[model samples]
Target: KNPKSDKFKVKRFHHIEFWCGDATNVARRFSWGLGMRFSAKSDLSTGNMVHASYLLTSGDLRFLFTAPYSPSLSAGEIKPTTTASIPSFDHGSCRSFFSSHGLGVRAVAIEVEDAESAFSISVANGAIPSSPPIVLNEAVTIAEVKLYGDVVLRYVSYKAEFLPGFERVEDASSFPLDYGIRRLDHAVGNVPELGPALTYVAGFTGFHQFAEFESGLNSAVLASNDEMVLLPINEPVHGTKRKSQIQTYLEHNEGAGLQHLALMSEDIFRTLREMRKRSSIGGFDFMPSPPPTYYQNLKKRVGDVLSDDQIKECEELGILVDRDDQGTLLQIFTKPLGDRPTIFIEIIQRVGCMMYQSGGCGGFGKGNFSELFKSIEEYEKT
Candidate 1:
């Protein structure tokens, strides 16, 4: 049908929203571990009585964490007969999303020219609208649609600060931390099937195929026409020797949900070193390293693209390396961030490749997928 039209186009990812059981707890963990400091927050005190929220930022990354405060709070903690309950606005499938998906990214938001126009077009083109356009302020408008399982595709048209009702966090650390982690590069999600998901997305949002790979859980990449946002939708291949990683994600997550986020970094060596320093103090536990042979054999595949010292550091830090026609890519993945092996983070750095001129220049590390899948298999075994 209509894959791309001139009506409206998404600018870039505005913010990624996570449905959580405790916004404060997740926010604190990220702030301490990922160097993403809190920039704004909202809760009952801010006249938004439905949920508690915290907005964290690091470079170009904007993460919004929210949790409801009613049944999980008032219904259990506060007396029901103490006072007449106040009517509150709907949370829009948030309760169900959190209960089923646990603490994971529920919305992959994209900035667009107009929220109403963008949402109307998609809805008209067969996408189910979760909520109508919400005009929070002159600078902010939000609209959402269901994107497989409980995940949401949010369209935000805004010019100023974060969403309405959120109070500015005064004296917040406004600069990017020294960890070298920069922006959100690409996000991957696991679904039950790839064909329908791809058709559904391309039918409404008009994203075109960007890349495809079958070695690692069988996935396809889709991107905005401008390549500003990259989303890789993955599904398990049926003939796996063991339980597929994507299948594990779907099982643990209870449905299709965001599986991992690729955070772009300028320099991954320093970034991973900083991340490793806090392994016991709020830092993330990265996946185990590849065998020494993986690095020993790297010299041939990588050639002189990486210095011997650089490759050595990668080996020590468990960073995976790959290259595309454009340039080299170095990346590392953290173990699942929560009790369930459903969500994780990928720290990445692109070398000698296009930057903002194009969204992802160093590719999605297709070569590393096999190694990564093997790592997951090992991790799952024990």
Candidate 2:
């Protein structure tokens, strides 16, 4: 059993940093599609010469998109920090990432009570220290560790405004779309070495394994004690008759990387209805509709708990439903956000789903995995 401890003391997820080819364009894309608004930015215009970063937020969800200013650089050469005076390895590694991977999540930051202690403890627990703790003038102190792939985990102290170097900006875009989605529910990572990844995170961040299951493959879901941050680690099951989604992800991503981000919605039916309209208008696609049989099975399992009207609405919109003794879950999948199918999204809503015995709680709808896999297989077919 994993014992409780405050060694790392991570309060919650702070923000996600995306290394993109164009920060502004990517930020605007999320704003128009996900109902996020531009919160702040930093670049040469803001006195930062190395890279340009844009901040977007929807409720408690924060995303920072950054891209290097220099267009010409070797895959291993660009750095993303101002402290070039320090050793080359000490600088932020944004330039190298942009040079290597195109647009993707490069960092996941977490709020901590004490940045120094969090860094020191995490390093001692087998985390590779990406950079030494740095205090940004009088704003905030931060540190980082290398996670799976090129992604880094950042430990940051709370700040009233944006991080020190960033300045607030007003969004002038007219694409107004709000789907009632709130905070990030969870982030899943596809890894060839799932065992090592989970061990590293649990040791470095004091997270515990909340649940484990096989949904066409093996997956272990880890969550913070506060339940603010949930990370589901996926690995391909070898020797199986069919290639799993995890294998497909690793093959296409060129290596292990983030698979999909699950966003929480208070009213999934309304959120998905609006999203479907947006997908049509924006010329994008969501996951294929579930088979009629899948909806029939869902009705048999959860029809008693949910209203008939709710079930009918789900069938009409192709939403998936699952239930346990505690409650039911509602979820839907979206097509990849970018050209490459490496990253996608899951919209989820938990309705009274609580299982204390096994911590089956509300995260990803495990019961609906069969339907989800079938949907993905259908996508692969076409």
Candidate 3:
């Protein structure tokens, strides 16, 4: 359901920016591995001297990876010199981030009709403003508000070709077309506690709780009024012999940060098949496999919805399936992008079945959690 006040609206998920040590290498990994086209770049050679940024795109999903040249100059330290209009490059901030968290999501930008109103309302509602509204040329205006941990939420106008400083790469068309990755389905965050984090998101962003679940870990799904952006927030539930994944993430990450991003696909079978082939040849790793018993249970649970051949194929490829009354969801997880076991990716496809007023299974694959949790626990042993 939508929030009571529609005063400030989030149009859709726009893009995510990451602070990394090697922006170019990260961009190339995403480009060839996930089929994201390398779209643009900005660096000292391209007129920007302080830091370098690489842009990747697949359909409406965009990601920016940036890193500073030196560890001494942080992002905050980049200040405009007397002669230049734009500020100089500073790597200290990024260096600090990478030093603590390694490669991780730094900012999440959302498309909004009015960046000013988004900033103002969030501020009035108790959100701490990180960046005041700033015009990035005539094409875009952006503002930032602090969110859980180090992540900042950005409200951006879509008027520009991209961000103000970005220039389209000349070789953009030369990359292979996207296999089928479309929009971002959701971005999950790990927090110290569920109640406080969900409350913070609600009080500040005007999003409402859509669905929630608890097994060993507790989580709640929150969405915008229009259901354009879905945030699944999670926190650890203490007392387990094995460390909670959320707690593990917080400890290794050194703070709260984005856990994983789920990318939507219309045809996940084809997408995963292609992704797997590319991964084998390109050196990308996927999550540890669920036991063979998982597919047997899946075959029983989905019954009639997927054919024996379909189930067999998914089992062969290690895809997991779950369904509520209204629909069936197929999903697969990628191994952590970096060596820290912090951030990862999820590829998901939803097919509707029984329908309801609000739709179905807003919960994150409830039926598959046990299998997933066990898989992760097994991964930790290694």
TM-scores of all predicted structures: 0.88, 0.86, 0.88
Q: Which scores higher on lDDT, 1 or 3? A: 1
Candidate 1, 244-292: lDDT as tens digits:
8888888889988889999988778888888899878887899888877
lDDT of 2 at 79: 46
Local error of candidate 3 at residue 243 (angstroms) = 1.6
What does candidate 3's lDDT look like per residue over 1-382, in tens digits?
A: 4454444867888998888888988888777888888887777656665678888988888988888765333334424331111222234556877899999998888899888888999999888887788665566778888777878888887663666566788874548558689878889899888887887778888788775434557888778876668888888888887678888899999978899999887678887887888887663578776876677666667877899899888877788887766667888999888889899999887776333223224346876877666655665665
Can you give the lDDT of residue 291 in candidate 1?
71
Which candidate model has the greater lDDT, 1 or 2? 1
Misplaced by over 4 Å in model 3 are: 4-7, 70-90, 212-215, 353-362, 371-382
* lDDT for position 228 in model 1: 71
- By lDDT, the best candidate is 1
**Candidate 2 wrongly placed segments (more than 4 Å):** 71-92, 171-177, 212-216, 353-360, 371-382
Q: Write the per-residue lDDT of candidate 2 for residues 41-108, one digit (tens) a residue.
A: 77767766556788888777888887766633223444443522111122236656655555678877
Q: Between 1 and 2, whose TM-score is larger? A: 1
Residue pair clashes in candidate 3: 50-89, 73-91, 73-92, 74-92, 74-93, 139-160, 326-354
Q: Could you tell me how far off, in angstroms, the CA of residue 254 lies in candidate 1 after the best superposition?
A: 1.3
Candidate 2 collision pairs: none
> Distance (Å) between predicted and true CA of 215, model 1?
4.7
